[PDB]
Symmetry: D2
Subunit: 563 residues, 4 copies
């Protein structure tokens, strides 16, 4: 068996990788040890970066059809039990109106809830239709790199046969116990994240719409067990920190707080997680992404979203090198750009955990309270005294602080800042962040930042600056007085053998600055240009259309391509 | 004929007064010169203050059913003609996500579009059903006050008869040429409004969904004539600054910019206003409100809304005096609180006109271009030069500044600050506005400010702080540690024979601070108290439930009622 | 007082007559003993003949906005 | 369902397709809790194939049946694997 890219693993990072590569004309073979896409829901929060990617490759409308929209995710309830009495709520997943504006302004896309259980088969299937070969019941056993490619050994769990595959590159998308990362020799850091901690999950069915429809939320946390919506509002799953038989049904009833709504206990799983990140993600011809280089807690739902973005960063790069349009040094930028994201999210997901204890300290409970102790803490909370008033305020302070892992981390989600050989510096210094860079997105058009979203119009219809770009190619954005970029881009494109579309945004053009929001956001004059990588990151910025400005485009694209 | 209050005029201010008064048990007689409620739509923008009043008296849902919602109002298009090319757009009626968040945060209610044509009969209907006597085709001729009441005269346009109608008070709600204001001898000021030119209005029917559906807007301005939606998207009105035959069908056809869609010309009207405000609105037993004391331009849609709020200030006050619960000096607060609003809106509505000239100047167009002159303006606008870039930016700067009269004036709408004998000062100084007080609402719970909106929950259901108050009665708001307010309020209540309802917001109460937003907004400790007048304004604020804090309750109510 | 048609009563039959007549250019005077339109709901079912009339005189859409639709009435 | 010269041309007429006539619609609604919809095979297929795999079926693409031979106890089929050859 022969291919250009062997993709070990078929979860979000592997599947996304295969879809993008097939969309780019690259032969790849994607494998999976197991029989079918992930049985469990296993993560549900889709952020905007991920929706942007689905948009670009035309799966957003489809993703939105299966997903629970934003309006359903906001009411995060802290209570004794579902049918008991609330301690309070916080506005999760950017449901506060100010948080909602900041969200809507950053992207044409929105938070939704789509269990991995559905996301996975949707992308795997698109990989197969776009051109990727997909082979389940097939296990990677190891490989051996040489100068020209790699030769991997596979074990076929249907035929029992064992065969080899010859490929030019391997992507290790094989998860939290990546054998591809082991054999590649990737160093890991940060093993220090508490004692190794695991949770248990109990799926179950039950019509709890009568306790949920009037306070629509993605989660209900009981003082700690999480009650999590799979489908509103009849498919569910209990989660909590860590064998169990059908007694699991007593737990559930207790979490629901009533035993009066018929329940149906489904599969019971555990999940372990050894929090670490890979310090480097690349070794020779091997590239790892996903859980294979960042392993962490679920706080914030950064896992699947960062994984998918890992693949979006890499695919167009493999394609340009495989086609000979780019020197293989272009692949160096994968580690330069994505490994800082990897450490960032492990540390972030872990730091969010320490926002919970203070909730208990506010209730003057201990790390673990009894049933009597819990009912005393509720009584103390309803005290009509100044000491009680101070406690209600202390509880509210603590609760509010947990928002960082429950939709408050907009900055974490969006504020990528790349520095590498695939981003051509413009000479400006790093302007930094005016507000907290974890809580708040700051749009930037400095090279290394994601292209900012604003609305233009095409045929008097709204269209995002993002929808002008992507499509697996470079796009250069300018305005009417920057007409010269059209020709300068043609010359670079012809010499370098690379597609780069130019868009001249302005009155009378194909794309119109209808609200003037592009002039407001671009940070440069009308004749300036922004060059956008296939992955939506700005790689070059000129402040005008002068000679030196124009002449630099060639140098920039040459430098990005390693040529 | 005898009655407590004679209401001259049955537009928004009169109809509202009648409804509120009849709701409070007060006998009133409302009259109108004409056959019907106003034939023209006239005035369409319903701001949040007005929707809050409708909510309080229970007409909001019905208002919403007839009203075009907010999301249909946002696209304000500046162009040559409807089917021509746009110069650009501004986000009107707070459609920009950030404006929208500020909007949603300020009230439980929202902008809608509801022409006067539908609003009047709705309210006049409710007035009549709540208890008001309503009599049209009846004209106020004059009146004579004396120490115990007034004895005005009426001309009955059906029977031809002429009769007298004694009453304790007269409300002059009779419009821009109020004969009641003349007779009462109210001084006016600020006549200088630029030559007092009228506008012309052409109704017409035409299906313009294909030019509108994709950029849903409340109005489309052509370079200047306003094409304004009455019903989306088939009923319209054409408007511009100032006889006309059914030639008006030609004008429209060029304003539509295409004589292809069938047009059916309706009625043609002229409006010519004189800009002024009454320096005082009260004289003996005569109280004026609406156009009768504030007459200005349409910029901002402040007329109908301020008019209705005038009526909301006054009714509960008349009712208390008529019932003997309040001294007649309570009525002095009407002038003190509403007259500053009256000058504020005439001046504001006028100041907005001056935001349009700059649009032409950016275009380099004289106060009145020709066809060929305009055509050249659009050519100069697509000029690919550095100077053409400077011109596009100049046009955008000028357009953006027109928002102040097209939704941007949130602060103007909501930042009422009352100083009068009906607001009991709490000893704190005025905190002022951190942001521009015309553009931005700043919530405050200092006496003199409208009660801030926040979401509480009742039965785990969202309910506004506002929905706890109103209903033509004083409400006192506190928390669990302010338990003592309940008792003080009862004592005060018996003493003065005045109903005040107490709400102790907190865990396990009727109303719950479920998001903690009340603790955040109140500006005082949990055991503090806010006293809210029937019209939603705060009149007293205690910072806690200490002895002196509680003792002051009686003093405040006794001072608000003039007793 | 003079008029072409004197309409005694302003409930559905009188109000409708007045609207139709005024639509046809006919001078009419409609009177009512009481203060208001009827306080009680009284009568709620609007059959198709009536909606057709509202449609003809252009009040159907407004009728539909205030009305509970058919699919709420079945059980 | 429109019969015409071209989409933007002039209709010859329409017919009420897929039981859209109200009498046809009642007969339809009375026969089943379910309704006609339009779902291209392009989407139907991956939705069911994926559910087969999750429910317990082994699914193997790029694999071709070449023939078989039945006997008394079962059948033995020969497959050609288009990935491994
Ligand atoms: C039980 C469980 C519960 C989770 N719950 C949450 C949650 O609540 N919230 C949240 O944010 N995240 C959660 N996650 C994490 C999550 O699903 C991801 O971070 C994401 O799936 C990782 O993407 P991958 O595509 O990087 O990972 P994976 O989805 O694990 O992909 C690895 C793939 O490679 C395959 N594979 C592995 N080894 C081999 C091999 N040797 N040969 C061939 N194929 C191989 C695997 O079968 C799989 O197909 C959960 C994970 C698990 C396992
Ligand atoms: C043609 C026209 C177009 C307008 N367009 C706009 C617009 O586009 N935007 C905007 O913001 N505002 C507009 N307005 C202004 C507007 O209608 C509001 O300011 C508001 O209606 C005024 O409320 P009132 O209730 O205070 O005034 P009115 O609506 O005029 O109510 C006055 C009432 O008193 C009656 N009356 C007067 N004199 C006597 C008398 N001697 N005896 C008995 N009854 C009497 C009148 O018939 C009427 O019933 C327009 C006004 C007109 C006339």
């Amino acid at each position: 068996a022969e291919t250009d890219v062997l993709i070990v693993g078929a979860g979000p990072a592997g599947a996304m990788s295969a879809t993008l590569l097939a969309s780019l004309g690259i032969r790849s073979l994607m494998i999976n040890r197991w029989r079918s896409t992930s049985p469990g829901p296993r993560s549900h929060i889709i952020n905007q970066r991920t929706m942007e990617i689905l948009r670009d490759i035309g799966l957003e409308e489809s993703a939105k059809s299966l997903a629970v929209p934003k309006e359903y995710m906001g009411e995060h309830v802290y209570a004794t039990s579902l049918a008991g009495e609330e301690f309070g709520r916080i506005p999760a997943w950017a449901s506060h109106p100010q948080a909602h504006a900041e969200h809507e302004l950053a992207s044409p896309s929105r938070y939704c809830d789509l269990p991995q259980l559905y996301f996975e088969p949707m992308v795997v299937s698109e990989a197969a239709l776009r051109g990727a070969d997909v082979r389940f019941l097939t296990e990677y056993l190891g490989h051996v790199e040489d100068q020209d490619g790699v030769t991997a050994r596979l074990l076929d769990h249907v035929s029992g046969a064992e065969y080899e595959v010859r490929a030019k590159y391997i992507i290790g998308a094989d998860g939290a116990h990546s054998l591809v990362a082991q054999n590649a020799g990737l160093p890991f850091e940060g093993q220090m994240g508490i004692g190794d901690s695991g949770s248990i999950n109990i799926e179950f069915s039950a019509d709890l719409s009568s306790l949920c429809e009037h306070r629509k939320g993605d989660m209900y946390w009981m003082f700690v067990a999480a009650l999590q919506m799979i489908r509103p509002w009849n498919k569910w799953i209990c989660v909590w920190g860590y064998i169990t038989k059908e007694e699991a049904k007593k737990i559930i009833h207790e979490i629901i707080g009533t035993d009066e709504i018929p329940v149906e206990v489904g599969p019971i799983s555990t999940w372990t997680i050894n929090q670490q990140y890979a310090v480097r993600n690349t070794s020779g011809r091997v590239f790892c992404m996903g859980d294979a280089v960042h392993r962490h807690t679920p706080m914030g739902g950064l896992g699947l979203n960062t994984s998918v973005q890992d693949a979006y960063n890499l695919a167009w790069k493999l394609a340009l090198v495989l086609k000979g349009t780019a020197a293989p040094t272009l692949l160096d930028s994968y580690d330069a750009e994505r490994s800082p994201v990897a450490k960032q999210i492990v540390e972030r997901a872990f730091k969010s955990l320490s926002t919970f204890p203070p909730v208990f300290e506010a209730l003057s409970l201990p790390p673990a309270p009894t049933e009597s102790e819990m009912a005393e803490a509720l009584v103390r909370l309803k005290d009509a005294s100044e000491e009680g008033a101070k406690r209600r305020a202390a509880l509210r302070k603590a609760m509010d602080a947990t928002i960082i892992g429950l939709g408050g981390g907009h900055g974490v989600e969006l504020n990528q800042r790349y520095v590498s050989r695939a981003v051509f510096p413009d000479g400006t210094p790093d302007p930094g962040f005016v507000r907290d860079q974890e809580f708040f997105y700051q749009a930037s058009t400095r090279p290394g930042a994601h292209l900012p979203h604003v609305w233009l119009t095409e045929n008097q219809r709204r269209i995002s600056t993002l929808d002008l770009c992507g499509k697996g190619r470079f796009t250069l954005l300018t305005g009417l007085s920057g007409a010269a970029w059209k020709h300068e881009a043609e010359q670079v494109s012809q010499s370098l053998g690379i597609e780069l579309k130019v868009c001249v945004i302005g009155p009378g053009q194909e794309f119109v600055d209808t609200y003037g929001e592009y002039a407001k956001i671009s940070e440069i004059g009308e004749s300036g240009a922004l060059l956008v990588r296939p992955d939506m990151f700005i790689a070059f910025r000129a402040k005008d259309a002068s000679r030196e400005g124009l002449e630099q485009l060639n140098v920039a694209v040459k430098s990005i391509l390693g040529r």
